């Protein structure tokens, strides 16, 4: 759902409103209906709400970097002049509420309405088509809520106490309602560990196996050791989902959402994300997270570290005055010393801060920010770069919480301006690259089911070293997952683990590693033999839908958009210029010669140059 201003909706639907006014005998003809709509008489607004019902509208935010930049929503009239946007889609649109604007388009034809209602509906596009990770998931405040809801704190009010020779167990509640009653009287902290008898929540897999041999059913009671907050959180998840009983970090929530998407229909995920949003906002409001000058604690050991490193720097300076080291050597030594000082200050800051500090709470929960920002806020700014790009060997010791002096601020401005200017042109370069990528790849479209080819490419899954057990490859999610096997995998003896034409998920890789398989041949677009376009099996499964790609999808545009979307956040060589060089297939700047043929090498240092000669072992040239 989206909130549409009354005036905007009236203007968009003017013809429909005029039709519904004339046919309802509010106006005698089309001219009268138009005149009534222009003056906005009260009868217009009654018909407007009837007209807009079940009429989706497309929202867009420029620039449209990828597919999810345009999404269909069901409109509803709202007082005022600002469009109301659902918080969960802000990640897809890359939108923030600091003055951004969105454009609204009205589908007219029945085909367009069907496409908007099915293909482009916001609730049907949870996952990212690029990597397949969920996007319409809790973030920022919501996470900070759920985190606080599910964190366990020792020594809390109403904490469970083991039975003694004088009294039985204390913190045991007959049902979650009793726990809520206790919480409402200040007798039970929401984050206090307790024992509670649950009946409507499925227990975890191993507990279910250990307790119910015939399978858990609704109404069966079982005692769980957990906090009231975790119990409330598990009520947001679908009925059949097993109990989690774990602190809700960002990655934990992402894992849960990914599990839901794989094993549950799309509607259930859309409802669960809304429930999580509501709970997260409610408990973020009451999480106690706030910013104050006192909350920004400083490490007591900062002064000693700074004085020691200042003594070291003075020693280096006195050495330099003798002439033992050059200017570049002095700069390098100072840079190393101040890097060490910054690292020690950061370590001290991390150690000193308490667990429940709001600044650390926000970062650790994964809602937003990073520890480097905290270190520069409280600990010390560190080193800054000059216009030339080299590190200045005069660090800004004073943190912003203390306040930089004039000269430190002036030098920091250099790096700030450089970063801003770089970001200014990143967008243009990325847009140009995306345009070229889209244009080149526009011809790749899935045209048939399978080309019936035995060819493919080899992808490694794991490597075995002296430890004996084969360790999984780090880059396996982007290589082996969401692919098809070209040939059957056979272990050392010869038994087949997975037959050809099987989707490679997580269980498939787990089974293959157990059997001892390290490399697998998978069908790929590079080897597709289809006469026109490509085939579904070679491409694999669509990341967005998690199912086999369907005939008629323009995978080329999707690939181009996926490549181009993260371009804006690549440094400006190992960044966007490097990507452009690689894709343009031009001679690299720092060209490295490649051995034409094996043999023995020889070299001769020369004036401003090397020279290398390779003598083939086989042959004489």
């Amino acid at each position: 759902q989206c909130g549409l201003p009354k005036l905007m909706a009236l203007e968009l639907f003017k013809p429909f409103v005029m039709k519904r006014l004339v046919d309802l005998n509010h106006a005698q003809n089309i001219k009268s209906a138009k005149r009534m709509v222009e003056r906005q008489r009260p009868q217009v607004w009654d018909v407007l709400e009837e007209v807009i019902a079940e009429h989706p509208v497309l929202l867009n935010r420029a620039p449209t970097l990828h597919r999810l930049g345009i999404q269909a929503f069901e409109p509803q009239l709202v007082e005022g002049k600002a469009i109301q946007l659902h918080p969960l889609v802000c990640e897809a649109f890359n939108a923030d509420f600091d003055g951004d604007q969105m454009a609204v388009h009205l589908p007219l034809s029945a085909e367009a309405q069907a496409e908007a209602r099915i293909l482009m509906l916001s609730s049907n596009n949870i996952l990212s088509p690029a990597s397949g990770k969920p996007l319409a998931m809790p973030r920022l405040d919501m996470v900070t809520g759920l985190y606080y809801l599910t964190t366990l704190v020792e020594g809390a009010t109403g904490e469970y106490q083991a039975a003694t020779k004088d009294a039985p167990e204390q913190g045991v509640y007959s049902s979650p309602a009793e726990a809520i009653m206790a919480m409402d009287r200040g007798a039970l902290s929401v984050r206090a560990k307790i024992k509670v008898r649950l009946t409507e929540l499925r227990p975890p897999t191993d507990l279910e196996a250990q307790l119910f041999e015939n399978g858990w059913k609704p109404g069966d009671a079982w005692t769980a050791e957990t906090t009231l907050g975790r119990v409330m959180f598990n009520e947001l998840l679908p009925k059949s989902y097993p109990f989690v009983n774990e602190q809700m970090h960002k990655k934990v929530q992402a894992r849960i959402i990914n599990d839901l998407a794989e094993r549950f229909p799309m509607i259930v995920v859309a409802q669960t994300v809304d429930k999580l949003k509501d709970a997260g906002f409610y408990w973020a409001t009451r999480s106690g997270v706030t910013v104050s000058m006192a909350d920004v604690l400083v490490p007591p050991q900062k002064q000693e570290i700074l004085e020691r490193h200042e003594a070291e720097a003075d020693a280096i300076e006195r050495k330099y005055q003798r002439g033992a080291l050059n200017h570049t050597e002095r700069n390098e030594s100072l840079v190393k010393i101040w890097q060490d000082a910054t690292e020690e200050v950061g370590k001290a800051l991390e150690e000193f801060y308490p667990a429940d500090n709001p600044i650390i709470t926000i970062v650790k929960s994964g809602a937003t920010g990073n520890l480097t920002q905290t270190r520069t806020l409280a600990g010390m700014k560190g080193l800054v770069t000059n216009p030339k790009g080299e590190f200045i060997p005069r660090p800004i010791k004073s943190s912003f919480r203390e306040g930089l002096t004039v000269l430190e601020y002036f030098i920091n401005t250099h790096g700030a301006r450089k970063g801003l200017a770089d970001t200014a042109l990143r967008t243009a370069d990325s847009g140009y690259l995306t345009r070229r990528l889209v244009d080149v790849s526009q011809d790749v479209i899935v045209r048939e089911h399978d080309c019936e080819t035995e060819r493919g490419i080899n992808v490694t899954l794991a490597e075995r070293g002296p430890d004996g057990t084969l360790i999984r490859d780090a880059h396996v999610e982007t290589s082996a997952f969401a692919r098809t096997l070209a040939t059957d995998a056979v272990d050392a003896n010869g038994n087949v683990i997975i037959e050809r034409g099987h989707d490679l998920g997580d269980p498939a890789i787990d089974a293959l590693l157990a059997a001892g398989i390290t490399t697998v041949k998978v069908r790929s677009v590079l080897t597709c033999t289809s006469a026109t376009g490509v085939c579904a099996m070679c491409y694999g499964r669509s990341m967005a839908t998690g199912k086999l790609v369907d005939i008629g999808e323009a995978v080329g545009i999707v690939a181009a958009q996926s490549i181009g979307e993260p371009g804006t956040q690549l440094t400006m060589v190992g960044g966007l210029p490097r990507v452009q060089e690689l894709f343009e297939a031009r001679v690299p700047r720092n060209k490295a010669p490649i051995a034409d043929v094996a043999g023995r090498v020889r070299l001769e240092e020369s004036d401003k140059f090397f020279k290398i000669t390779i003598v083939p072992d086989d042959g004489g040239e």
Binding site: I70, F97, V289, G403, T405, I557
Partner: protein, 691 residues
Amino acid sequence: LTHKRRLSALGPGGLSRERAGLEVRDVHPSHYGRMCPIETPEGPNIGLIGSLSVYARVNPFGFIETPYRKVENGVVTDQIDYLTADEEDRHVVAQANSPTDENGRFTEDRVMVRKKGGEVEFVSADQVDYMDVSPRQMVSVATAMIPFLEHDDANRALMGANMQRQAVPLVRSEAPLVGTGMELRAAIDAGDVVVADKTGVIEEVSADYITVMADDGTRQSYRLRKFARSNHGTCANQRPIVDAGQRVEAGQVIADGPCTQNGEMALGKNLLVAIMPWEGHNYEDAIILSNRLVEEDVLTSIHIEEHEIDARDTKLGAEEITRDIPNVSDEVLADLDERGIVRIGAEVRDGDILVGKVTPKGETELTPEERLLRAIFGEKAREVRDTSLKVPHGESGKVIGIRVFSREDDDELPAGVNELVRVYVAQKRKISDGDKLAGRHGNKGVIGKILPVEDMPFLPDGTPVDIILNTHGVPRRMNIGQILETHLGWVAKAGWNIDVAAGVPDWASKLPEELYSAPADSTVATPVFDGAQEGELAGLLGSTLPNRDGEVMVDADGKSTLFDGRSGEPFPYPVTVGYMYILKLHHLVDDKIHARSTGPYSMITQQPLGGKAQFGGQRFGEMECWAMQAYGAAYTLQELLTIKSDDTVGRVKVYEAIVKGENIPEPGIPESFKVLLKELQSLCLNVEVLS
């Protein structure tokens, strides 16, 4: 004021925005004291446009000089010399904020200085030969009005400095509780306030003029601008502040300007703020406001717009300004003056007539149906067609002024123009959802929700807060200076008194005597790079005066216990509460909302025009087409590119189908492709379509 001190690298003989690399737009060490490193555009003009520093002066050759204090033998001397960049490159300059004795000799053994290459170094006190005039030598006028600037990151400081120039004037203005010392001088330098020319005694004070009898026999009268439209449609209103029989001195402010209060610069309003997330309404930089700001017109502003119409000559006869218009209801022209112009004090809305005008038609060639309709009603085929000036779409407000120029009575109008009529419409806009507010530290945001007073969290004494700002912004944006602003604003509003029974406290050792105690609602000044310190602020928070009931709402840490307005239970943890200076930027949803269903089209391409001035259509760019192709929405894309843009026949047929309630017809052959084909046919290319 900032516009007049702008240094631009573009223009003839300058750079081009498409041919400017990183090197030119980066900060150079020589800028110190000449070009402000903070104030600069955020967009593609980053680094190409800057502002002159406070103390910078221009050499007749065109080079920018800055003042420095001559120091010899490690003793700062009263002599001041203006140096150029190349001239200072041969000297060692020490920062102003360096300890010095009453005599002038440096107290410390080593001083911080800048060398030839702009490199910062410790040197012996005898090596320095120049010193900075003031700690704020490097900042511009706008940057000088950000309190606690040194605690704010460069990006946020730049954003705040840029935002300060977009504040719209309010109906009533008040100076900030906490600010710099610049607000005063700037207000006088901008020249919008009225300053007495000669010392004397005020004679007569009205809302329109001020008469002052000078000390000698001379007397001077000053005319005050009242409700005068500015270049951007913002009210410019000057009002007196002096009283009859009051002695005034030359250079003393006698009338306030648009955004000034008692001779100081007042761009926004100081209001109570609580730093906490609230039910997700301030999510992603959104802001919640109390309804009080609407009831009391705290953030209300007057906006004036001018409409111009002209009656001129034509080959068919001159067009006349008349009170009678063909085919108009008698009620429509009810507020029109006898001449046909709207009456002052009327309330015009969208589509209302402002000035009545008519133009000769000439040929008629009326259609047979129209001829029959006129015959059955006996209506004359009038010679003139209506061309009256009508209020644009979405406008409103009272009519305040009318100006008429007629060639008959001089009125040297352009050739062919016989009459010129200007109408001024003024409207009072209250803060509403979607309006953009911001602070002085780059913490911008749009208003997402306006709550009734009973819903806002309130202090334990019953006082409700005015604004709720999210807590997740500050730490990652590195603009912690706003928290110090909030603390010091709370300290300023509620008076403070430092007990001096057991001597003076250690933290307050360096505070001037005047800051030992101050009454309630006392304003304070914290100059950039020389102002309130950490420990001083902490102590002042810990030494505030109680309220009317003899109790302190805010503890020594700056946090207070709030109550939930909706549920009624107290919030589990204390919340940071204080006073912040929030200013209203000129980005209001009122003037950017337009939608379109059908409107004017282009001459050649026949596509909809763009812009809110016309019934502008939104551009469906190439990237949107890529997105539609990625979705596989073939039909939506086809209708967007043909039916809704330039399928001339398809447009009218689709309108007819929608009105009649029928299926949408098939599109075909947008006009742009035909134009392209017949353009390629030119320049000798045989382009043709086969079947």
